[PDB]
Symmetry: C3
Subunit: 145 residues, 3 copies
């Protein structure tokens, strides 16, 4: 999937970004079974003061995570996973839970392209990894930490 | 809700950001009943000329509001809220209305988290507030301009 | 439509940005039949090192298109246009297809404003584009490449 993660500039060091990215990627693999490299975490940094809560200007502890997913998963799972992104980012970034916003949007797999291919359904990933070129299979396996 | 606002760098001074974010927040709450703090306005600045229209590179006067809403509201209300945003940002950013694009996105409340918590149905908003931690009732209350 | 293009700062010259934007804008009108000025391509630049695939940080060679459409077009049609976007962006950004991710999102036209006006259904661009206003078409007609 794709996680847009809006944050203030300089709020996270490279280690913290790599820490927040990691906890999100491990939330997702861990509750869905998705092959790691399938997850993208994409930081959007903007200057602090660009974020307003109830018309009040905020400092730089706001975190907004927008996960773009595939249709097909239960409402009980999306909650856990959202809840787990809340907890594990709160630790990884050392910011209070109450500073964290998480929305999930969903689309059908057939209008969702990753690594230049169309995606499988959620219960079809095994077929997905057993019908790609190895130039492809090699690339994605470089994208796992 | 979360309103991502895409503007060209400095088209809105820090006050002008406050006015717009105050314009979006006051259309929402006024038209839905959503408590004041519930609304985030998120400014995403980019250098001028990163925006294209029909292929024609543009200047620093485009605005695109992308609204992320809970499912469960009528189309009437949503188009009503879309117009008032166009109207009230025009006035608050002194941008001509033909520059303002507004989209609304909906997701089930059950996969949306604000202040580390899952949202209610729009028909549950007030009770949801009551049974929050008092850390949470208060941290929220501090974000109402 | 609004295409959010997520690219790293400096991966694209002003000529290359116009190349990608022309690639997206053309595919979309070619396949939907929608009038030129209706398509916006919004570049969103961030320093390299902000994108993570499988927890591994990336250089400036990742591109993410998040496309936002009216509801009403077929799955085969949506799939064809994402594929065309992959092919044509890759060429116009001299980038390799494995580095391109494409997500389409859809919403009710009745909650979609462009140029400060509401949108017709995916086939109503005639009647709509012709009873606009005095200048609404006019200001929208300059935006053709």
């Amino acid at each position: 999937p794709v996680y847009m993660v809006y944050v203030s500039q300089d709020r996270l060091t490279p280690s913290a970004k790599h820490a927040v990215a990691k906890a999100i990627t491990d939330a997702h693999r861990g509750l869905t079974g998705a092959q790691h490299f399938l997850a993208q975490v994409n930081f959007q940094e903007q200057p602090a003061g660009n974020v307003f809560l109830g018309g009040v200007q905020q400092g730089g502890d706001t975190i907004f995570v927008h996960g773009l997913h595939r249709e097909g998963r239960s409402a009980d799972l999306k909650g856990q996973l959202a809840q787990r992104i809340v907890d594990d980012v709160s630790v990884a970034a050392e910011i209070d839970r109450k500073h964290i916003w998480v929305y999930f949007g969903e689309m059908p797999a057939q209008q969702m392209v990753e690594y230049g291919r169309f995606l499988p359904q959620p219960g079809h990933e095994g077929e997905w990894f057993d019908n790609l070129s190895s130039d492809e299979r090699a690339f994605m396996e470089t994208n796992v930490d």
